[PDB]
Amino acid sequence: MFNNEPLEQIDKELHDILADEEKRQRETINLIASENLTNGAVRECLGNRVSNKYSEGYPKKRYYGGNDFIDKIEELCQKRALEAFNVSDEEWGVNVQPLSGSAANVQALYALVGVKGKIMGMHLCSGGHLTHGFFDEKKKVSITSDMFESKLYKCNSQGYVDLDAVREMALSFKPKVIICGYTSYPRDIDYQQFRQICDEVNAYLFADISHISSFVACNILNNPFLHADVVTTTTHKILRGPRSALIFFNKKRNPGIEQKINSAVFPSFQGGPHNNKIAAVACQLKEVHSPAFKEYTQQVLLNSKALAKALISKQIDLVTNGTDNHLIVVDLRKFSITGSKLQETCNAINVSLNKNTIPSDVDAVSPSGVRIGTPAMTTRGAKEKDMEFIADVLARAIKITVDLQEQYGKKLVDFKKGLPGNAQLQQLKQEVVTWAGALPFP
Amino acid sequence: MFNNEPLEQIDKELHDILADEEKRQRETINLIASENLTNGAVRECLGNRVSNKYSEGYPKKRYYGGNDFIDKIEELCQKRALEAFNVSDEEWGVNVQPLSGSAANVQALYALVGVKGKIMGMHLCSGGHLTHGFFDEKKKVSITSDMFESKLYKCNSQGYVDLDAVREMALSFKPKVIICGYTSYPRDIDYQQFRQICDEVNAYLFADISHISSFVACNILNNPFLHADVVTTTTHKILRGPRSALIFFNKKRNPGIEQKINSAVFPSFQGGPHNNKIAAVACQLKEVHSPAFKEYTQQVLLNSKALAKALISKQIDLVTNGTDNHLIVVDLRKFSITGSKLQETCNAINVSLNKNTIPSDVDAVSPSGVRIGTPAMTTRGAKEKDMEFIADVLARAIKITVDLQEQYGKKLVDFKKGLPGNAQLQQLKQEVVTWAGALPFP
Ligand SMILES: Cc1[nH]nc2c1[C@](c1cc(-c3ccc(S(=O)(=O)N(C)CC(F)(F)F)cc3)cc(C(F)(F)F)c1)(C(C)C)C(C#N)=C(N)O2
Ligand SMILES: Cc1[nH]nc2c1[C@](c1cc(-c3ccc(S(=O)(=O)N(C)CC(F)(F)F)cc3)cc(C(F)(F)F)c1)(C(C)C)C(C#N)=C(N)O2
Ligand SMILES: Cc1ncc(COP(=O)(O)O)c(CNCC(=O)O)c1O
Ligand SMILES: Cc1ncc(COP(=O)(O)O)c(CNCC(=O)O)c1O
Ligand SMILES: [Cl-]
Missing domain, CATH: 3.90.1150.10 (Aspartate Aminotransferase, domain 1)
Structure with missing residues (x-):
C-alpha cells in the first residue's frame, strides 16, 4: 500500500x-x-533502506534487536575513522553518531564541562565557529555561549592566533576546555603550544579540524591527535563525505571519557542514529585511506x-x-x-x-x-x-x-x-x- | 579527480x-x-546532489548566495507542511531544519524557556520521550532535564494520563512549558484539558505528536493545532518520511515566537541545514495530502x-x-x-x-x-x-x-x-x- x-x-x-x-x-x-561534491557511492548509501531502522544505543548495547547488520556498519565506520586518522583503537575512541558539526561540538563540550561549564574559543570575526562559544553583546548567539560560560580570544593585527593573549585569558579565566581549529583560518595551528597552555591551567585541549581534516589524515599538516584530548571533524568538507560529524577522544590521556562522550551523544542529546549517514561515512572513510586521496589532498x-x-x-x-x-x-x-x-x-x-x-x-x-x-x-x-x-x-x-x-x-x-x-x-x-x-x- | x-x-x-x-x-x-518503509522517491531525494550545498540561514536571508533553487525547496517544504496539517500559513509557521526529533524538542524548549527554564513532561516509564525532561535519581539522563529544570508526571494505575496529577504538579511547580504527546501511549490526548491547565499557570502548551502525526493530519484523532503553542513531529515514523523533524509554532497566539524558534534552530544549535532531508520531506509531504494516504492512515x-x-x-x-x-x-x-x-x-x-x-x-x-x-x-x-x-x-x-x-x-x-x-x-x-x-x- x-x-x-x-x-x-x-x-x-x-x-x-x-x-x-x-x-x-x-x-x-x-x-x-x-x-565539496560527493561521489555516487556516498549518495547510494544516503539513499539506502538502512535509514528505516531504529538503532538507539551503541553496537552490541542496542535498545532494540534486529540490529546485527547495523552493528556491523557502525563498527566498520568507527574502525575506518581511527585507521584513516592514524590512531590506534587502543589509545583513541570515536563516536560516529553526531548528525552534524554543530551537534558534535555541543555534545563534546557538554561531556567535558557540563552545564554552566567554562570554555575558551576563537572569536567568530577572527576565524572561529559559532559553536566555539560565539556571542555578541546583543545576544548569546550560540548555545555554546549560553549553556556554557564562554570567553573569546582574537587573532592579532597580522591575522595570526596570538598565543600570548590566549595564555593571558586562559590563566585569568581558568577554563575547563580550550578550543582550537577554525572555520576561516588560512594557516596551520601550533597544537603543542595549545597543549602546553591547557596543562598550565588544567584545561582540556579541544581541536575542531573540520576544515583541515584531510590534511591531518594525510600528514600534510600538524597532527592534533598527538596533543588533543578531543578532536571533532565534520565529514562533508575537505573529507568529501556526507553531512555528518565525528568525535574523537583520547582514552589514554583520560580514562572514563569514552562513556562521558558516548552518553552525551546518546541519550543526553540525540535519539535514533541516522544509519544512512553512518553507512555513507564508511564508504568515504575507505576512500580517505587509499593513496589516491592523499594525491587529491595534495x-x-x-x-x-x-x-x-x-x-x-x-x-x-x-x-x-x-x-x-x-x-x-x-x-x-x-x-x-x-x-x-x-x-x-x-x-x-x-x-x-x-x-x-x-x-x-x-x-x-x-x-x-x-x-x-x-x-x-x-x-x-x-x-x-x-x-x-x-x-x-x-x-x-x-x-x-x-x-x-x-x-x-x-x-x-x-x-x-x-x-x-x-x-x-x-x-x-x-x-x-x-x-x-x-x-x-x- | x-x-x-x-x-x-x-x-x-x-x-x-x-x-x-x-x-x-x-x-x-x-x-x-x-x-516504516520509505518509498523510492523519498530515497532519491536523500541521495541527491542537493546535500552538497551550504545554505546556513533561512530562505531569502541566506548567508551565502547561489541558494535560489535551495530556497524554492525549503519554501515548498514549509508550504506542504502547513497544508498537510490543515493550518493557514498566516496563523501557523514551521521550521523544516531540525535534523531529528530529539534536536527539534531541545531547540523548541530552549526558544520558549531558555537555560535554567522550567518544563513538565510525561515520565519515560509511563510513555514520555527522553527529550521530555527525562531523568533518573542516578543522573540527568536527557539534556532536557539538565539545561532545563524538569518535573515528570505519571500515568495512573490503569495506564491513562492523570490530569488531576498534572494540575497538582503544574500549580505547585509553575512551569513555563508542559509537554504532551508521547512515545508509547496507546490512547488519544485531551489537548483541551492541557490547554486549560497551561493557561491557569501561564505555561506554554507543547504537543509532541511524532508517533501520531498522520492521525492528526488526516482528522482521525484530536487536533492539537487548535490548542497548542508548539507542535513538534518527526517525519520518519507513521508519516513515512525521512529521518528529520518539524517544529510548528502558533504566531497568532504568541507573536515574536517565529524568530525565537527560527533563531534557536539556527544559529543557537545547528549550522548548515541538510537539504537532501528537506527535499526528501517535501516529497513525502506531497503524499501526505493525497487521499490515498488518508486511506493508508485509516x-x-x-x-x-x-x-x-x-x-x-x-x-x-x-x-x-x-x-x-x-x-x-x-x-x-x-x-x-x-x-x-x-x-x-x-x-x-x-x-x-x-x-x-x-x-x-x-x-x-x-x-x-x-x-x-x-x-x-x-x-x-x-x-x-x-x-x-x-x-x-x-x-x-x-x-x-x-x-x-x-x-x-x-x-x-x-x-x-x-x-x-x-x-x-x-x-x-x-x-x-x-x-x-x-x-x-x-
Ligand atoms: C555562517 C558561519 N558559520 N560559522 C562561521 C560563519 C562565518 C560568518 C558568520 C556570521 C554570523 C554573524 C552573526 C550571526 S548572529 O549573531 O546570529 N545574527 C544573525 C546577527 C544579529 F544578532 F542578528 F545581528 C550569525 C552568523 C557572519 C559572517 C559575516 F557575514 F559577517 F561575514 C560570517 C562565515 C564562514 C559565513 C564566519 C565568519 N567570518 C565564521 N568564522 O564561522
Ligand atoms: C529508547 C527510547 N527512546 N525514547 C523512548 C524509549 C523507550 C525506552 C527507553 C529506555 C531507557 C531507559 C534508561 C536510559 S538511561 O537512563 O539513559 N540509561 C541507559 C540507564 C543508566 F542510568 F544509564 F544506567 C535510556 C533509555 C528503556 C526502555 C526499557 F528498556 F525500559 F523498556 C524503553 C522505548 C521506546 C524503547 C521508552 C519506553 N518505555 C520510551 N517511553 O521512550
Ligand atoms: C570549525 C567548524 N565547525 C563546525 C561547523 C558546522 O558544522 P555543521 O554545518 O555540519 O553544523 C563549521 C562550518 N561553518 C560554515 C562554513 O565554514 O562554511 C566549521 O567551520
Ligand atoms: C515522541 C517522540 N519524540 C521525539 C523522538 C526523537 O526522535 P529522533 O529519534 O528522531 O531523535 C522520539 C523517538 N522515540 C523512539 C521510538 O519510539 O521508537 C519520540 O517517540
Ligand atoms: Cl541524511
Whole structure:
C-alpha cells in the first residue's frame, strides 16, 4: 500500500528544481571552502533502506534487536575513522553518531564541562565557529555561549592566533576546555603550544579540524591527535563525505571519557542514529585511506598555493599574505568594496564564494573580505595552471564591483540594481559557464 | 579527480552488508511502532546532489548566495507542511531544519524557556520521550532535564494520563512549558484539558505528536493545532518520511515566537541545514495530502484495532485494554516473562518489536511489556485479516518464551542459551519468513 512511481513521475514539481540545482552546481565555479561534491557511492548509501531502522544505543548495547547488520556498519565506520586518522583503537575512541558539526561540538563540550561549564574559543570575526562559544553583546548567539560560560580570544593585527593573549585569558579565566581549529583560518595551528597552555591551567585541549581534516589524515599538516584530548571533524568538507560529524577522544590521556562522550551523544542529546549517514561515512572513510586521496589532498594545497600566488601577482592582498592549507581570505580594503558586494558580483557570474571578516573589521556588519577554497574545484579536476583563470575571473569580478559601486553608490540596495544586464558580467558568467560546465562532475 | 565506480565495485565489503540489511527488512515482521518503509522517491531525494550545498540561514536571508533553487525547496517544504496539517500559513509557521526529533524538542524548549527554564513532561516509564525532561535519581539522563529544570508526571494505575496529577504538579511547580504527546501511549490526548491547565499557570502548551502525526493530519484523532503553542513531529515514523523533524509554532497566539524558534534552530544549535532531508520531506509531504494516504492512515488504525482484538481473543492483556491509534502495549505479567526475554524470542523468529514499561514497573531496568505498532506492516499491504496471523505468531512466541524460561531459568543469560536451535522457533521463523518475504516492499 505505497506509491513506488519514480521521483520524476510522483513529484515532477520537485524534480525540476533538483535538476536545476544539478545544472547550477555543474555550471558554477565553487570556491566555498566548506563545500565539496560527493561521489555516487556516498549518495547510494544516503539513499539506502538502512535509514528505516531504529538503532538507539551503541553496537552490541542496542535498545532494540534486529540490529546485527547495523552493528556491523557502525563498527566498520568507527574502525575506518581511527585507521584513516592514524590512531590506534587502543589509545583513541570515536563516536560516529553526531548528525552534524554543530551537534558534535555541543555534545563534546557538554561531556567535558557540563552545564554552566567554562570554555575558551576563537572569536567568530577572527576565524572561529559559532559553536566555539560565539556571542555578541546583543545576544548569546550560540548555545555554546549560553549553556556554557564562554570567553573569546582574537587573532592579532597580522591575522595570526596570538598565543600570548590566549595564555593571558586562559590563566585569568581558568577554563575547563580550550578550543582550537577554525572555520576561516588560512594557516596551520601550533597544537603543542595549545597543549602546553591547557596543562598550565588544567584545561582540556579541544581541536575542531573540520576544515583541515584531510590534511591531518594525510600528514600534510600538524597532527592534533598527538596533543588533543578531543578532536571533532565534520565529514562533508575537505573529507568529501556526507553531512555528518565525528568525535574523537583520547582514552589514554583520560580514562572514563569514552562513556562521558558516548552518553552525551546518546541519550543526553540525540535519539535514533541516522544509519544512512553512518553507512555513507564508511564508504568515504575507505576512500580517505587509499593513496589516491592523499594525491587529491595534495592537489588541494598545490591549487591553494597557486591560487594565492596568482592573486598576489594581480596585486590582491590576502590575510597573512598566503595559505598553508586549502583556503585563502582576500583583504578587499584597497578597493573600498565590501565582501557583501563582491559576493553579489560573483553570484551573478556563477562563482560561489562567501564574504568573510578580516582582523581590521571590528564588527561583522560589513566584512572587508571574501573566503575561498580549492577542495571543490580540485574534485572537478582542476590543476595549478587552472588557478590563473580563477584568479583572472576573481580580479575581473573585483574590478567590476568597483565600477558598479562608483556608478550606483556604496549602499548595497543601490549597488545590486547595477548587476542585472551588465554586459561584462554576462560576458564573464558565460566564460565561467563554458569552462565549468565541461569539467568532470561526480 | 574522483572515483565514480558504483558502490558495489568501490566498496564491496559495505554493499554486502547493506544487501543483507535489505533481505532481513524484506523477511521480517516489523512491529516497531516508530518504524516504516520509505518509498523510492523519498530515497532519491536523500541521495541527491542537493546535500552538497551550504545554505546556513533561512530562505531569502541566506548567508551565502547561489541558494535560489535551495530556497524554492525549503519554501515548498514549509508550504506542504502547513497544508498537510490543515493550518493557514498566516496563523501557523514551521521550521523544516531540525535534523531529528530529539534536536527539534531541545531547540523548541530552549526558544520558549531558555537555560535554567522550567518544563513538565510525561515520565519515560509511563510513555514520555527522553527529550521530555527525562531523568533518573542516578543522573540527568536527557539534556532536557539538565539545561532545563524538569518535573515528570505519571500515568495512573490503569495506564491513562492523570490530569488531576498534572494540575497538582503544574500549580505547585509553575512551569513555563508542559509537554504532551508521547512515545508509547496507546490512547488519544485531551489537548483541551492541557490547554486549560497551561493557561491557569501561564505555561506554554507543547504537543509532541511524532508517533501520531498522520492521525492528526488526516482528522482521525484530536487536533492539537487548535490548542497548542508548539507542535513538534518527526517525519520518519507513521508519516513515512525521512529521518528529520518539524517544529510548528502558533504566531497568532504568541507573536515574536517565529524568530525565537527560527533563531534557536539556527544559529543557537545547528549550522548548515541538510537539504537532501528537506527535499526528501517535501516529497513525502506531497503524499501526505493525497487521499490515498488518508486511506493508508485509516488502514493503520483498522489493523491496530484488529490486532488488539485478536490478541485479546487469545487471552493476552493490553495496557488500557485497547488502542485508539497505531500502537499496542502488551502486559506480559500473567505469563511471568519480561519484555526483555520476548524481544529476544521475537528476534529469533524475525519479528521486530521492543520491550516497554507498564504502569506497574516502578523502575525501567526490566520492563513487563512489549510495544507493537502497525504502520510498517500496513505499508507492506497487510489488511485486517492478516492480523490474526501476527496475533498467532506473537502468542506462539509468548508460549515458547514461557517454555524456555521454565527450562533454562529466569536469568536472561541462561534464557538466551535455549534460543539457538530450538525446533519451534526454526519452524516459526520459516513461517514468518515465507509470509514476510512475499509482501510488497518499497
Ligand atoms: C555562517 C558561519 N558559520 N560559522 C562561521 C560563519 C562565518 C560568518 C558568520 C556570521 C554570523 C554573524 C552573526 C550571526 S548572529 O549573531 O546570529 N545574527 C544573525 C546577527 C544579529 F544578532 F542578528 F545581528 C550569525 C552568523 C557572519 C559572517 C559575516 F557575514 F559577517 F561575514 C560570517 C562565515 C564562514 C559565513 C564566519 C565568519 N567570518 C565564521 N568564522 O564561522
Ligand atoms: C529508547 C527510547 N527512546 N525514547 C523512548 C524509549 C523507550 C525506552 C527507553 C529506555 C531507557 C531507559 C534508561 C536510559 S538511561 O537512563 O539513559 N540509561 C541507559 C540507564 C543508566 F542510568 F544509564 F544506567 C535510556 C533509555 C528503556 C526502555 C526499557 F528498556 F525500559 F523498556 C524503553 C522505548 C521506546 C524503547 C521508552 C519506553 N518505555 C520510551 N517511553 O521512550
Ligand atoms: C570549525 C567548524 N565547525 C563546525 C561547523 C558546522 O558544522 P555543521 O554545518 O555540519 O553544523 C563549521 C562550518 N561553518 C560554515 C562554513 O565554514 O562554511 C566549521 O567551520
Ligand atoms: C515522541 C517522540 N519524540 C521525539 C523522538 C526523537 O526522535 P529522533 O529519534 O528522531 O531523535 C522520539 C523517538 N522515540 C523512539 C521510538 O519510539 O521508537 C519520540 O517517540
Ligand atoms: Cl541524511
